[PDB]
């Protein structure tokens, strides 16, 4: 019991360090900077190909080939410039929660509600796409998949663990066990050296794939968090929660840096992503729309209402040309 | 203007036609979520029909393709994935009827039924409940009567009202009675017509679904 008391002493110590030796004053490091007024973005293309509610969005480094899966078990690979389709990959584990896209452009990741992270091959000979490996080893459900390279892959599985594999072996080469809840979201760094994961414990942790021990733990919410994304500087990450609060956490500061909320939103997040400069934050609420926050002033810059049902995932290009709000109304938009 | 991209548009149109026929194939099929208490009675009503986290049970009965999902062997936060099951036609909520005396357990199934019945994603979807184990409940009332786990009960300690009382006790848990129906059939090892009751309730919900899509409702 005294070991629990010493654990509470350590928690009080890491709260006293980020309380006394941290002097944020970030109503003053943002009143000097000018706002962005109000940004106006319109639906350039309505990618209309699914027949069910979708759950995933990730674009490649080409900024054209986005992947998107839905309830019907038909993840299709779109084309951002020409509205066309290039692949309609059939799959078995139809209750898909998430997808990803390899930075080389060769693979996609799938993953459903039945503990199977399927990775597919695209740039292959011998015809169509082909199920390369069947990554398993969890107990709960896959929630967010991401690629490091064509060799390695990290995920975020509902049985409290995050995992780093090797694809050609399929065994969990590194586990990540630090939570007491279901890790709902997962995001990577621009150098892909260290990632961050958000769970049901109202806490987002920063893991590193070198060793496997979580380096810092970031709390501050009141409920589950459903969207994590690193800032493009690689030194901050935005957490959306079910408390209508997409607060921005700072790694070097090591506390909650600032909080983003509004009065008449008592609603829930589903997806959060930055631009390529991070002045604006694409918070995808469940108010059948998504908002665009001026991410260094905690002010709203835009309202991208273009749907009829709640958005689920929201990807931004690697070169900052578009966002892709994908709603449960099956008609994922591309804004600009 | 579309030099070789005409063949790309033709490829997209071909696989779009494939997506359309696959969507029609999924539309004429009908899915049923299958809940249940922990090791209570769901092992019977996956065997009464023709027949990893989720495991499908794809069967058919009278020109109609059923897809059961006995999900309940997956231990996680149920609220953060149950939203994938909206738009399901029926939710078979299997309850052991004779588990009323164990360490309480009937109140655990009441809590799970109150969770799924008043759930915000399932406020329109009808729910079927299969009170199993009639072959044990007819003789664990004469000897170890129902007065243990119902203090507000009095009188009929026979089968002819006890299962009806537990049926009314479950049916009195919907707060929205004018929108969703709660069906009940007492399954048993003999007279394998439980799939007939599944077919009847799914037909009765397909009628309401087509009236809602047509505009009568």
């Amino acid at each position, epitope marked *: 019991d005294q070991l629990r008391q010493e654990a509470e002493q350590l928690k009080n110590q890491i709260r006293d360090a980020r309380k006394a030796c941290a002097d944020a004053t970030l109503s003053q490091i943002t009143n000097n900077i000018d706002p962005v007024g109000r940004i106006q973005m319109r639906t350039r293309r309505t990618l209309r190909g699914h027949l069910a509610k979708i759950y995933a969005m990730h674009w490649g480094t080409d900024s054209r080939l986005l992947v998107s899966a839905s309830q019907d078990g038909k993840l299709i690979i779109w084309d951002s410039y020409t509205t066309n389709k290039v692949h309609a990959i059939p799959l078995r584990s139809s209750w898909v929660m998430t997808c990803a896209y390899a930075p080389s452009g060769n693979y996609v990741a799938c993953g459903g509600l039945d503990n199977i992270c399927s990775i597919y091959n695209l740039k292959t000979r011998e015809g169509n796409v082909r199920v390369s490996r069947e990554l398993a080893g969890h107990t709960g459900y896959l929630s967010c998949c991401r690629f490091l390279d064509d060799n390695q892959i990290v995920t975020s599985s509902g049985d409290t663990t995050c995992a780093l594999w090797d694809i050609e072996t399929g065994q969990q080469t590194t586990t990540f066990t630090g939570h007491t809840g279901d890790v709902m979201s997962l995001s990577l760094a621009p150098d892909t050296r260290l990632f961050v994961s958000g769970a049901c414990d109202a806490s987002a942790k920063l893991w590193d794939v070198r060793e496997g021990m979580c380096r810092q733990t970031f709390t501050g919410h009141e409920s589950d968090i459903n969207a994590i994304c690193f800032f493009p500087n690689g030194n901050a990450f935005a957490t959306g929660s079910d408390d209508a609060t997409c607060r921005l956490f700072d790694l070097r500061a090591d506390q909650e840096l600032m909080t983003y909320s509004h009065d008449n939103i008592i609603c829930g997040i589903t997806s959060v992503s930055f631009s390529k400069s991070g002045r604006l934050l694409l918070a995808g609420y469940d108010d059948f729309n998504c908002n665009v926050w001026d991410a260094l002033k905690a002010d709203r810059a835009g309202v991208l209402a273009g749907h009829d049902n709640r958005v689920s995932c929201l990807g931004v290009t690697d070169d900052g040309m578009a966002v892709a709000t994908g709603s449960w109304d099956s008609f994922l938009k591309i804004w600009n | 203007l579309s030099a070789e991209d005409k063949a790309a548009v033709e*490829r997209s149109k071909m696989i779009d036609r494939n997506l359309r026929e696959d969507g029609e194939k999924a539309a004429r099929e009908v899915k049923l979520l299958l809940l249940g208490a922990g090791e209570s009675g769901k092992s019977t009503i996956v065997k009464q029909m023709k027949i990893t986290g989720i495991v499908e049970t794809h069967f058919t009965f009278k020109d109609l393709h059923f897809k059961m999902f006995d999900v309940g062997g997956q231990r996680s936060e149920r609220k953060k994935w149950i939203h994938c099951f909206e738009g399901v036609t029926a939710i078979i909520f299997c309850v052991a009827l004779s588990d009323y005396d164990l360490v309480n357990r009937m109140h655990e199934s009441m809590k799970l039924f109150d969770s799924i019945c008043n759930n915000k994603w399932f406020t329109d979807t009808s729910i079927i409940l299969f009170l199993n184990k009639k072959d044990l409940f007819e003789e664990k009332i004469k000897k170890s009567p129902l007065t243990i786990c119902y203090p507000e009960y009095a009188g009929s300690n026979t089968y002819e009202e006890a299962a009806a009382y537990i049926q009314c006790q479950f049916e009195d848990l919907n707060k929205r009675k004018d929108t969703k129906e709660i069906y009940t059939h007492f399954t048993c090892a003999t007279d394998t017509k439980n799939v007939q009751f599944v077919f009847d309730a799914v037909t009765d919900v397909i009628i309401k679904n087509n009236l809602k899509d047509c505009g009568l409702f």
Partner: single-chain antibody
Amino acid sequence: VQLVESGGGLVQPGGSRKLSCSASGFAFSSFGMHWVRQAPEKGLEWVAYISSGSGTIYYADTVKGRFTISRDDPKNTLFLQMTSLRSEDTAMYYCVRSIYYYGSSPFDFWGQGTTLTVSSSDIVMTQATSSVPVTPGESVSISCRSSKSLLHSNGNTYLYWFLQRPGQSPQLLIYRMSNLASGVPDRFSGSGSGTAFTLTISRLEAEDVGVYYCMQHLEYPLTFGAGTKLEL
């Protein structure tokens, strides 16, 4: 991947002959298909095309009306029923696989070919140099001018390069001027602009000797250059 043509032979002028191309080891019906032909001492000439799903069919002008291309997708087989065959049709007939989507590599596999000996507006792809001698290890630059600009408003330039080693079927090297086809060594590189194109080989190695074809894929009919020959 295997493609096996058959149906070749000797035919009297005015007669008919059906060629078959049997595909195996790949998802045949997902691919568009072409026939490309090669007269005895001459270059490549495109004959006919069937898209995935058979919705789109194109013929070369010199063969339209006379040749019919068709496919039997359940049996994974392509046919070309030819009628009223003339002496000018004597050629090796190649079956060619293709697929058109963003980043795809069309024309990436050719059959072994069948010889059909017969008894007795278009974009011009000028290749002014018919042969070039090359000593091993050196580096070479071949040029290929086009009669029309191949740069399209989308930014892609639809120029393809093939290699036919002596006695073998042709093999794709570069698609859309500068992208290396799968399996092709990095000694090949492509460059160019509108109406002007360049193939460059660095440290040329053995067996690389053969005929190099330029090809336009801007509009139908597809047209080839006269071919550049290497020699030891």
